[PDB]
Design a protein around this ligand. Structure first.
Ligand SMILES: O=c1ccn([C@H]2C[C@H](O)[C@@H](COP(=O)(O)OP(=O)(O)OP(=O)(O)O)O2)c(=O)[nH]1
Ligand SMILES: O=c1ccn([C@H]2C[C@H](O)[C@@H](COP(=O)(O)OP(=O)(O)OP(=O)(O)O)O2)c(=O)[nH]1
Ligand SMILES: O=c1ccn([C@H]2C[C@H](O)[C@@H](COP(=O)(O)OP(=O)(O)OP(=O)(O)O)O2)c(=O)[nH]1
Ligand SMILES: [Mg+2]
Ligand SMILES: [Mg+2]
Ligand SMILES: [Mg+2]
Lengths: 137, 137, 137
């Protein structure tokens, strides 16, 4: 299923020096997000840094959310994952998309400007209404 | 999409001193879960603690699951995430919802009673049946 | 919702000595994945190891992805989680399914051959097309 998502470019290098997020292939679940940075950021073991994307999206449909995830290679091989583990993006969020980058491993890592440092999937979400009961079936 | 989910209150403070989980806004993907605790729990760096919710849900529809996730602020800023990383709640689970709270950072943290310590999304899930093949297309 | 997923057995012990992944119950969201190993692997605190499944799947439908997650018991109780935190499996991926096993805790752990070391859910995914705007609504 396809959905057009409104995006506001906040940094003029996004779409230019830092390409807009893209699906690496046509069967790819996730779009790879790029670090919108002026200079490289050295992330020491155990440390977390907030990386700008230079963009804002507005999902708008409350039946939809996005989830930011590590990329497998960075996570597995380099211990470069998310400080919030999974980043949940609400349909009504219109701020800048930010990446909490966490070095969960033993080796210092250089986050380069423009690096595809995380990915994001769009998934349907269901809004629950609680029905109080004394017992289940 | 909307779904009524049966909930059993297990601790009588849930719905009273500890509010039932709620969507912070109407476009929010996740419901914030509250720590059903008698007293605050001090979580040292690197440590994990099992936090009760004082509630049980029964999703019941095998086309639906819930996923518990860190909240971004706690995860990023405080290193307060999940010890199981993501908590998957099965449609047929009827036990108490529990939160594995893990301090992945360097600073000791006080989990207060009633704190919105994690969030939960409901997502559709697909049940796979494997089709054995010698080769793909 | 149900979906047949093509699977290629890559190791002849899969489906024999190492059972194919299964839903523990009929309301279970996830299939438990087994470590296709010749011998046990001792995973020291803080270390990551790549575990084969001995199988390959081909989801094929770009409206579907899988997500690999820790199992709650291993994650919470033993600190045995995923080095990539969540493993996203793309619809067009046809390689061997691999598990990045990460010991996030303080105790050494033996990964036995055949152990149900992680689980996998199939979720619908939406492919986004960006619509550039100057302002949101
Ligand atoms: O990796 C992330 C995670 C979240 N967000 C944004 C989008 C999301 O809608 C908002 C709030 O996320 P969450 O609800 O997980 O964090 P919170 O701590 O509950 O903040 P709030 O009180 O605003 O809901 O932060 C990001 O930009 N990056
Ligand atoms: O953060 C969590 C994660 C899970 N659960 C409950 C709901 C879920 O349905 C059950 C089992 O979860 P999972 O299948 O991930 O753990 P397991 O180690 O495989 O236990 P089991 O053998 O019972 O399936 O534990 C929670 O209360 N909190
Ligand atoms: O735990 C995992 C995660 C991923 N994969 C496979 C399936 C997935 O389709 C592929 C690529 O995953 P991802 O896109 O997260 O990693 P990447 O670093 O971006 O590699 P690539 O550049 O190939 O997309 O790796 C696994 O076998 N196990
Ligand atoms: Mg990728
Ligand atoms: Mg929130
Ligand atoms: Mg299980």
């Amino acid at each position: 299923m396809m959905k057009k998502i409104d995006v506001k470019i906040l940094d003029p290098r996004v779409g230019k020096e830092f390409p807009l997020p893209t699906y690496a292939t046509s069967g790819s679940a996730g779009l790879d997000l790029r670090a919108c940075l002026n200079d490289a950021v050295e992330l020491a073991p155990g440390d977390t840094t907030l990386v700008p994307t230079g963009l804002a999206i507005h999902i708008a449909d409350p039946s939809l959310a996005a989830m930011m995830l590590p990329r497998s290679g960075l996570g597995h091989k380099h211990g470069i994952v998310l400080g919030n583990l999974v980043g949940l993006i609400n349909s009504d969020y219109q701020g800048q998309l930010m990446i909490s980058v966490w070095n969960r491993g033993q080796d210092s890592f250089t986050i380069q400007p423009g690096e595809r440092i995380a990915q994001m999937i769009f998934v349907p979400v269901v809004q629950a209404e609680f029905n109080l009961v004394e017992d289940f079936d």
